[PDB]
Amino acid sequence: PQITLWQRPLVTIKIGGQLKEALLDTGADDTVLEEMNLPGRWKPKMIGGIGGFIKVRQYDQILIEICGHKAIGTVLVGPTPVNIIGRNLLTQIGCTLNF
Amino acid sequence: PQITLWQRPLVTIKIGGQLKEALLDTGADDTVLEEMNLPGRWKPKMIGGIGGFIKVRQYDQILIEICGHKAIGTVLVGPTPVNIIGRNLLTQIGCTLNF
Numbered sequence A, B: 001p002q003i004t005l006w007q008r009p010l011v012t013i014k015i016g017g018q019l020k021e022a023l024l025d026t027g028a029d030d031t032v033l034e035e036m037n038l039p040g041r042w043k044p045k046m047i048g049g050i051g052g053f054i055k056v057r058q059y060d061q062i063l064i065e066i067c068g069h070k071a072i073g074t075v076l077v078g079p080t081p082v083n084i085i086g087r088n089l090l091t092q093i094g095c096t097l098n099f
């Protein structure tokens, strides 16, 4: 799809058997999702944003289907206010900015 | 330009007579710039992000030239870690996401 930016660029994702909405976020290096149940091993990580830092769990080689396109990569899980799809996964679905 | 997302989507901006770099950020509703000298009246505002909230100064009808495209709108100035161009200005330069 082409997506204009008059509204938040939200898409449906399927991850860990669950359906969620997430923001396509070109300002995010990495993918950060709200607390959710994910299977397997993880590693503690601190990440920074506009108002300071949060502690997240780092999960590698996680499958995510983003608006019907499959990607596999790192997902960070923690107290983010919104689910964010970052460039680590946007590059896999072929996402570009155009003006 | 078409911009792929293997690197941060940074562009040159000119605002308040100054040259700066800023991130084209589809996950940002509003435009937030690092402390800088802007002329005229402003209004206190608190905005929230990944790690909590920051106090910004709200400036309206500010001219910004974003990668050679002119836009006029609200700019928030405050302790953001990075200069962010949000959807309020991305819609004016015709920016879209495509996959």
Ligand SMILES: CC(C)CN(C[C@@H](O)[C@H](Cc1ccc(F)cc1)NC(=O)O[C@H]1[C@H]2CO[C@H]3OC[C@@H]1[C@H]3C2)S(=O)(=O)c1ccc2nc(NC(C)C)oc2c1
Residues within 6 Å of the ligand: A025, A026, A027, A028, A029, A030, A031, A032, A047, A048, A049, A050, A082, A084, A086, B025, B026, B027, B028, B029, B030, B031, B032, B047, B048, B049, B050, B081, B082, B084, B086
């Ligand atoms: C969380 C997200 C929903 C909104 N944020 C835009 C994201 O793109 C921000 C932009 C950004 C902020 C700080 C920073 F150091 C680097 C980049 N990205 C973000 O938090 O990403 C984090 C995390 C993602 O992976 C890595 O890449 C950058 C770091 C790092 C951890 S925001 O907090 O910066 C933001 C920006 C503009 C806004 N305008 C508003 N307006 C409200 C009044 C609605 O809220 C805003 C909130």
